[PDB]
Amino acid sequence: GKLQDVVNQNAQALNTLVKQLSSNFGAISSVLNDILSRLDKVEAEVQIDRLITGRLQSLQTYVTQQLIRAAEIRASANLAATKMSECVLGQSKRVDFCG
Amino acid sequence: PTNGVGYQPYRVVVLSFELLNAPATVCGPKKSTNLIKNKCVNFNFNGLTGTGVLTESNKKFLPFQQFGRDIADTTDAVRDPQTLEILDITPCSFGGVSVITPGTNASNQVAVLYQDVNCTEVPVAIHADQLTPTWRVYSTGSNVFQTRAGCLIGAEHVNNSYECDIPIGAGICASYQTSQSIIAYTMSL
Amino acid sequence: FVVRGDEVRQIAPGQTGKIADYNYKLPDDFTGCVIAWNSNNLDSKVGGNYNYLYRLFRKSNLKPFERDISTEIYQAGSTPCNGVEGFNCYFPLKSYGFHPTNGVGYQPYRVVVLSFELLNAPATVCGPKKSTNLIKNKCVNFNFNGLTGTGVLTESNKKFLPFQQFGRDIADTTDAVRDPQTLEILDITPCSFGGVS
Amino acid sequence: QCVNLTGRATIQPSFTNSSHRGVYYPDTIFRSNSLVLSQGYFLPFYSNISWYYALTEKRVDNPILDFKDGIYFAATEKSNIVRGWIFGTTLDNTSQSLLIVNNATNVIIKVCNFQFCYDPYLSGYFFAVYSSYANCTFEYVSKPFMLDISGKSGLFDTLREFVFRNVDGYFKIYSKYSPVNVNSNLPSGFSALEPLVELPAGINITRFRTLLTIHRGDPMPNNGWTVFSAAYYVGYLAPRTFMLKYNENGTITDAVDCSLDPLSEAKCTLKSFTVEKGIYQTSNFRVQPTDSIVRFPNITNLCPFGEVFNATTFASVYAWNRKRISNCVADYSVLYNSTSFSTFKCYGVSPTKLNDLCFTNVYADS
Ligand SMILES: *[C@@H]1O[C@H](CO)[C@@H](O[C@@H]2O[C@H](CO)[C@@H](O)[C@H](O)[C@H]2NC(C)=O)[C@H](O)[C@H]1NC(C)=O
Ligand SMILES: *[C@@H]1O[C@H](CO)[C@@H](O)[C@H](O)[C@H]1NC(C)=O
Ligand SMILES: *[C@@H]1O[C@H](CO)[C@@H](O)[C@H](O)[C@H]1NC(C)=O
Ligand SMILES: *[C@@H]1O[C@H](CO)[C@@H](O)[C@H](O)[C@H]1NC(C)=O
Ligand SMILES: *[C@@H]1O[C@H](CO)[C@@H](O)[C@H](O)[C@H]1NC(C)=O
Numbered sequence A: 001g002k003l004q005d006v007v008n009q010n011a012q013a014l015n016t017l018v019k020q021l022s023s024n025f026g027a028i029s030s031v032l033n034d035i036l037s038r039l040d041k042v043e044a045e046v047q048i049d050r051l052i053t054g055r056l057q058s059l060q061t062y063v064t065q066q067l068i069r070a071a072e073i074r075a076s077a078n079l080a081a082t083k084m085s086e087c088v089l090g091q092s093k094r095v096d097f098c099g
Numbered sequence B: 001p002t003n004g005v006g007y008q009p010y011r012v013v014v015l016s017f018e019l020l021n022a023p024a025t026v027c028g029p030k031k032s033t034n035l036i037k038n039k040c041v042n043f044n045f046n047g048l049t050g051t052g053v054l055t056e057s058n059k060k061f062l063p064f065q066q067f068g069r070d071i072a073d074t075t076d077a078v079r080d081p082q083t084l085e086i087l088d089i090t091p092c093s094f095g096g097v098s099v100i101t102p103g104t105n106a107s108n109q110v111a112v113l114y115q116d117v118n119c120t121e122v123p124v125a126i127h128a129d130q131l132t133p134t135w136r137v138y139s140t141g142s143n144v145f146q147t148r149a150g151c152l153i154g155a156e157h158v159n160n161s162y163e164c165d166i167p168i169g170a171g172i173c174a175s176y177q178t179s180q181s182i183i184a185y186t187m188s189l
Numbered sequence C: 001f002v003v004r005g006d007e008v009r010q011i012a013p014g015q016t017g018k019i020a021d022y023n024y025k026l027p028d029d030f031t032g033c034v035i036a037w038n039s040n041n042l043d044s045k046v047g048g049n050y051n052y053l054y055r056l057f058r059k060s061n062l063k064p065f066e067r068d069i070s071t072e073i074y075q076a077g078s079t080p081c082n083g084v085e086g087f088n089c090y091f092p093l094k095s096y097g098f099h100p101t102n103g104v105g106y107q108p109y110r111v112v113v114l115s116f117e118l119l120n121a122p123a124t125v126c127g128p129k130k131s132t133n134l135i136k137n138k139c140v141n142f143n144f145n146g147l148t149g150t151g152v153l154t155e156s157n158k159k160f161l162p163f164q165q166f167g168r169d170i171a172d173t174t175d176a177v178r179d180p181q182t183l184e185i186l187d188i189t190p191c192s193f194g195g196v197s
Numbered sequence D: 001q002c003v004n005l006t007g008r009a010t011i012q013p014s015f016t017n018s019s020h021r022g023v024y025y026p027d028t029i030f031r032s033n034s035l036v037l038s039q040g041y042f043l044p045f046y047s048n049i050s051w052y053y054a055l056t057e058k059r060v061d062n063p064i065l066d067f068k069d070g071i072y073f074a075a076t077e078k079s080n081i082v083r084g085w086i087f088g089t090t091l092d093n094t095s096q097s098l099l100i101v102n103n104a105t106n107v108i109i110k111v112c113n114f115q116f117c118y119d120p121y122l123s124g125y126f127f128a129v130y131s132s133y134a135n136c137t138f139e140y141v142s143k144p145f146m147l148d149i150s151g152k153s154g155l156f157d158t159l160r161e162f163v164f165r166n167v168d169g170y171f172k173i174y175s176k177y178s179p180v181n182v183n184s185n186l187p188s189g190f191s192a193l194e195p196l197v198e199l200p201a202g203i204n205i206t207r208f209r210t211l212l213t214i215h216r217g218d219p220m221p222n223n224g225w226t227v228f229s230a231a232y233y234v235g236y237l238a239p240r241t242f243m244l245k246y247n248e249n250g251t252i253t254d255a256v257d258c259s260l261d262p263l264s265e266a267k268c269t270l271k272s273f274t275v276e277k278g279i280y281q282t283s284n285f286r287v288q289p290t291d292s293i294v295r296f297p298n299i300t301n302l303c304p305f306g307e308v309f310n311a312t313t314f315a316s317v318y319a320w321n322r323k324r325i326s327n328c329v330a331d332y333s334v335l336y337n338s339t340s341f342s343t344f345k346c347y348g349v350s351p352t353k354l355n356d357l358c359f360t361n362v363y364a365d366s
């Protein structure tokens, strides 16, 4: 599970990023085609701006969470490299470091 | 008949539309055209304008249905209002293309990695018929090398193994060697 | 131009109708002003002022700011009818029926549409504001050719092009301006000095 | 008067490419020292230019060509043979056209109703392009150009590049001049066409024709159609996304097509002209739609607007009528003949987008 949820933390983020495409964000609809087929240029712009702002905020949120998780994974990988160097490649006198 | 315009009679007609997922009952005066498939076009079915490529498929729509969505609330498929045929909409763009290059002041030569594709169906995944010929030389050729990360066109594959400069993925790397050309190889551990 | 009253609301971007489809269409990104006033007892006389024409039929919608002065016979049926009037093919232009006793919806109106540009070009038309005296090295609100900004003005030399009024920077702020009266290239520096502790 | 020329060799257009030429200014913003991604109708790099020339053999090239979304017209010559342009949609007295013709000192620009004769040509001495102009508004004369029929020998020395566009009722002309020495071929390199003039022609332009001069002269009693070494190049603008570099003077020093090769499109997403060694993911720029498909249900019944509107009596407002409108076609153009609408407001849809929509359950209160 200590590995598995990591995968379950990465597939769930992309799925939520896809499912956030079906959001109005205050616009009339969540579909660019509906807005561009029902409204003219001057009046669909205020709806497309809402959709663009919402989806850009969604992408920024996803990237921020990915950066947080990448920092945590990098800390774990640094620990794993230290374990490999100090216990596989040698013998460690540190208590409870390796077993 | 001699009263002021503020008290003259007026006739008001108020029209109400619904625009549902139902067969179209009233339409605009815009006349139809001839359907073309497997080509990046702007379509307009029942007053639903979109952009993409159209393929014949069978998604088994309900009889009182016109379009089918997906989990991203995009038009996954539409029904032809004249031939009663269930078409299929695929996005024109192919995000998932990588350009592998040396420095700009080294060569104007690039290799193109197409991700998770099988190299025979590259021209129908890129739509190479609608591209400029400078793209169409990069879709097919004799430099096609199939990797586990899609496949790579524009870099010859050698059986030797070196330490690698440009990592491509799935163990495949690329470099700019010797006239001068881009080579791809399995990375040497 | 001259339209009837009921079509005065059609002079607007995004509108549709008879004037906005066959006669005069405003672009969707219009930057201007539309003025219209009642012109009865000036554009209409007794017995009918049949001098103003409007296009009733056209083969296609008009693109913005496009004039269709042609007068070819419009075909509305099946036969080409060899370019004469009669059945299923009509004259495209029709005369207005302005009368002094007509209703307000049928009274003649006069419409003037002004189009503005506001470019980085020398100013051609100005407002009625009176100019003031330029002061330098002091935090002021400045209005150069309609550029209402705030800052300090310093004499400099950035060598503007002859057909230039202001020069930007990488942050799209007004880095420098040309004086409209002395043709002297000033320099705007922000009034505040964030960077103090 | 107009004389239809005989003996002329058939119009055989050769072909060449637009190697990095035709870059113009898409808008008047005056940006300086900036890389800008701009979508607009641009001439693609290495595009298929069709090429015509005047060589006396004994052929002049004044054909009639399609004006689609603006054109790029590059002319190379010795003695200023290209001396005008015809624009319009029918090129007759039934429609309004545009003439740009320059004699020895200045230009003449007239948006009028010329009855252009078949095979028009300019008569050069030491004219016969139209027959009558009437019922027109615009007239422009104030623009200089160099014209002299002299020194008719040697390899070409002048290259004049033009970009013609007709948007928002404005005819935009962009121009550039460059001295080159070539052998009957377009020189390669970069071209930045500065904005020249902006006509309020406000006319429908779909099909154009160039103008060449003729030298009948005195020393040819046989009506000698001796023309001189000149060659022009036409390319068609397409909706692309260029990357433009503006220097301190506001001039486009360099541009990137972004739809040409993978190097340009990977050069277009990284927002730099020099990419470094590595592998880059790339946004989409390569493929653009060309055709438009409209498909509506096969119903042809005109909608009863003669009963919903123009009835003998309507219902009173306290007992307002309800009528279901069904199996119609919704064109409001049939009501322009008789009724002028005082108010026409629409909520949820736009009035100009009604003709491209299909509804399901239209109801009509009255
Ligand atoms: C402008 O001129 C053209 C000349 O061809 C007019 O005719 C249409 O041109 C388009 C060009 O693609 C054709 O597809 C149509 O079939 C033509 N005929 C029509 C619409 O009846 C065109 O109508 C003129 N006006 C505009 C606004 O384009
Ligand atoms: C409508 O027209 C198409 C072709 O234009 C034809 O195939 C079809 O049978 C017609 N009738 C319908 C869809 O009811
Ligand atoms: C796809 O690639 C596989 C190789 O793993 C190959 O066997 C197969 O024939 C390809 N599919 C085609 C060519 O349709
Ligand atoms: C490289 O290896 C492949 C693997 O079978 C082989 O078919 C090919 O002939 C080799 N090329 C050489 C040795 O040049
Ligand atoms: C306008 O007035 C200013 C002073 O008020 C004067 O210096 C200038 O010469 C005048 N003319 C122009 C063209 O600026």
Ligand SMILES: *[C@@H]1O[C@H](CO)[C@@H](O)[C@H](O)[C@H]1NC(C)=O
Residues within 6 Å of the ligand: D002, D003, D004, D118
């Ligand atoms: C060329 O002009 C002459 C003028 O007399 C005319 O008779 C002839 O019909 C014209 N050519 C064509 C193809 O119309």
Ligand SMILES: *[C@@H]1O[C@H](CO)[C@@H](O)[C@H](O)[C@H]1NC(C)=O
Residues within 6 Å of the ligand: D016, D017, D019, D046, D185
């Ligand atoms: C473009 O034209 C030049 C000369 O006109 C030619 O050498 C070249 O092969 C052409 N094609 C390209 C650059 O694809």
Ligand SMILES: *[C@@H]1O[C@H](CO)[C@@H](O)[C@H](O)[C@H]1NC(C)=O
Residues within 6 Å of the ligand: D015, D048
């Ligand atoms: C340009 O178009 C002509 C039209 O027939 C064609 O023959 C020619 O091959 C085209 N040029 C290129 C480089 O594709």
Ligand SMILES: *[C@@H]1O[C@H](CO)[C@@H](O)[C@H](O)[C@H]1NC(C)=O
Residues within 6 Å of the ligand: D101, D102, D103, D104, D105, D106, D108, D127
């Ligand atoms: C020739 O140029 C003069 C100005 O030099 C101009 O007034 C005249 O209209 C032009 N005539 C023609 C036929 O172009």
Ligand SMILES: *[C@@H]1O[C@H](CO)[C@@H](O)[C@H](O)[C@H]1NC(C)=O
Residues within 6 Å of the ligand: C071, D135
């Ligand atoms: C052109 O203007 C004259 C001037 O009176 C007018 O009589 C005529 O109807 C107009 N139209 C045409 C097509 O001649």
Ligand SMILES: *[C@@H]1O[C@H](CO)[C@@H](O)[C@H](O)[C@H]1NC(C)=O
Residues within 6 Å of the ligand: D247, D248, D249
């Ligand atoms: C800008 O233009 C001026 C005058 O046209 C010229 O002297 C200067 O060299 C130009 N700047 C650059 C960088 O070319």
Ligand SMILES: *[C@@H]1O[C@H](CO)[C@@H](O)[C@H](O)[C@H]1NC(C)=O
Residues within 6 Å of the ligand: D310, D338
């Ligand atoms: C309304 O319809 C009648 C016929 O029912 C027709 O005579 C009349 O011209 C129409 N238009 C009106 C009253 O504006």
Ligand SMILES: *[C@@H]1O[C@H](CO)[C@@H](O)[C@H](O)[C@H]1NC(C)=O
Residues within 6 Å of the ligand: D337, D338
């Ligand atoms: C347009 O309205 C006039 C009004 O009298 C009428 O005579 C004419 O027949 C109408 N044209 C149509 C309905 O096409």
